[PDB]
Write a protein that holds these residues in place. Structure first.
Motif, mmCIF file in Angstrom:
data_model
loop_
_atom_site.group_PDB
_atom_site.id
_atom_site.type_symbol
_atom_site.label_atom_id
_atom_site.label_comp_id
_atom_site.label_asym_id
_atom_site.label_seq_id
_atom_site.Cartn_x
_atom_site.Cartn_y
_atom_site.Cartn_z
ATOM 1 N N UNK A 112 0.820 -1.215 0.000
ATOM 2 C CA UNK A 112 0.000 0.000 0.000
ATOM 3 C C UNK A 112 0.850 1.260 0.000
ATOM 4 N N UNK A 113 0.212 2.357 -0.377
ATOM 5 C CA UNK A 113 0.881 3.649 -0.427
ATOM 6 C C UNK A 113 1.178 4.139 0.984
ATOM 7 N N UNK A 114 2.441 4.332 1.354
ATOM 8 C CA UNK A 114 2.752 4.882 2.676
ATOM 9 C C UNK A 114 2.135 6.259 2.839
ATOM 10 N N UNK A 115 1.615 6.574 4.028
ATOM 11 C CA UNK A 115 0.907 7.855 4.202
ATOM 12 C C UNK A 115 1.745 9.074 3.863
ATOM 13 N N UNK A 116 3.062 9.023 4.075
ATOM 14 C CA UNK A 116 3.893 10.195 3.822
ATOM 15 C C UNK A 116 4.193 10.393 2.341
ATOM 16 N N UNK A 117 4.032 9.359 1.519
ATOM 17 C CA UNK A 117 4.394 9.448 0.111
ATOM 18 C C UNK A 117 3.314 10.173 -0.679
ATOM 19 N N UNK A 118 3.730 11.138 -1.494
ATOM 20 C CA UNK A 118 2.834 11.704 -2.484
ATOM 21 C C UNK A 118 2.677 10.730 -3.650
#
Ligand SMILES: *CCC(=O)Nc1cc(-c2c[nH]c3ncnc(Nc4ccc(OCc5ccccn5)c(Cl)c4)c23)ccc1OCCN(C)C
Ligand SMILES: [Cl-]
Ligand SMILES: [Mg+2]
Length: 266
Positions: A218-224
């Motif tokens: 999944x997309x890490x929360x900090x990554x745009x």
């Protein structure tokens, strides 16, 4: 180039302290005391499990001693007894995976993106040397100083890290530089999640079917979305469509010139 690798006598180094053991062997913190040079060097000594001819071992050790890149660990010396003992310079901050877990609250966007650049530079050098890592992960990146990391444990293959392997490596045992790009994307995901386990709780037996269904980490929360799309392209089924390590150096270096634009941290 024989001079690049030192064949150490047993008296030239002393295992001062254990750093950790695993299935493959035990790593020690020790002192290198070269004969006739009056110095004491702190080094790491990995003693592999007692198992393969000496000439074959030295031939691979020569390759490990010949790497000349600031982001690739170099084999300083070797001692051949009942076991194979590998000597290299001590990386005092340990592996990058333990480092990000210990310092997660104090790690910013510039630190993370600089690590992605340095890891991509080390892998691009390994590719230019026609070397395939086959085990790239955050655990196999050592931290000399908080902003100088090096890739290690390459060419040691000469159980299996299923959750870091490309699909063609799991199903077809194909190991290429583009399969290392898949592992690089997982390594980036480890850093952006501050050391989270990939596919946590899922058995390695089910990883292949998960990737076949189209599911990815999944997309890490900090990554745009720009950062995550680069990670997603590393996990393409067509290995030729994944980014090259050369392009990965360029993209993450541009993102490193403005880190807060691409990583959103508290
Ligand atoms: C992520 C957890 C981890 O890696 N733990 C760990 C770290 C070290 C370690 C700490 N500080 C170090 N400085 C220098 N070297 C090591 N460890 C290594 C790693 C590889 C080595 O040889 C392979 C090699 C050499 C040259 C070129 C390419 N490859 C050597 Cl000699 C030393 C290090 C040490 C041990 C551990 O954990 C060990 C067991 N874990 C439970 C897996
Ligand atoms: Cl290890
Ligand atoms: Mg290791």
């Amino acid at each position: 180039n024989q001079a690049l690798l030192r064949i150490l006598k047993e008296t030239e180094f002393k295992k001062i302290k254990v750093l950790g053991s695993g299935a493959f062997g035990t790593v020690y913190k020790g002192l290198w005391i070269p004969e006739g040079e009056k110095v004491k060097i702190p080094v790491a000594i990995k003693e592999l499990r007692e198992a393969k001819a000496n000439k074959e071992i030295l031939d691979e050790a020569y390759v490990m001693a010949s790497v000349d890149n600031p982001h690739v660990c170099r084999l300083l010396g070797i001692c051949l007894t009942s076991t194979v003992q590998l000597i290299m310079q001590l990386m005092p901050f340990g592996c990058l995976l333990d480092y990000v877990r210990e310092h997660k609250d104090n790690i910013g966007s510039q630190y993370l993106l600089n690590w992605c650049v340095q890891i991509a530079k080390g892998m691009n050098y390994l590719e230019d040397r026609r070397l395939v890592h086959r085990d790239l992960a955050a655990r196999n990146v050592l931290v000399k100083t908080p902003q100088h990391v090096k890739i290690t444990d390459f060419g040691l293959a000469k159980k299996v890290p299923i959750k870091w392997m490309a699909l063609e490596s799991i199903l077809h045992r194909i190991y290429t530089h583009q399969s290392d790009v898949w592992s690089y994307g997982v390594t980036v995901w480890e850093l952006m999640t501050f050391g989270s386990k990939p596919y946590d709780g899922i058995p390695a037996s089910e990883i292949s079917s998960i990737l076949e269904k189209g599911e990815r980490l999944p997309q890490p929360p900090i990554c745009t979305i720009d950062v995550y799309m680069i990670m997603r392209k590393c996990w393409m089924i067509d290995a030729d469509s994944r980014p090259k390590f050369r392009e990965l150096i360029i993209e993450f270096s541009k993102m490193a010139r403005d880190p807060q634009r691409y990583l959103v941290i508290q």
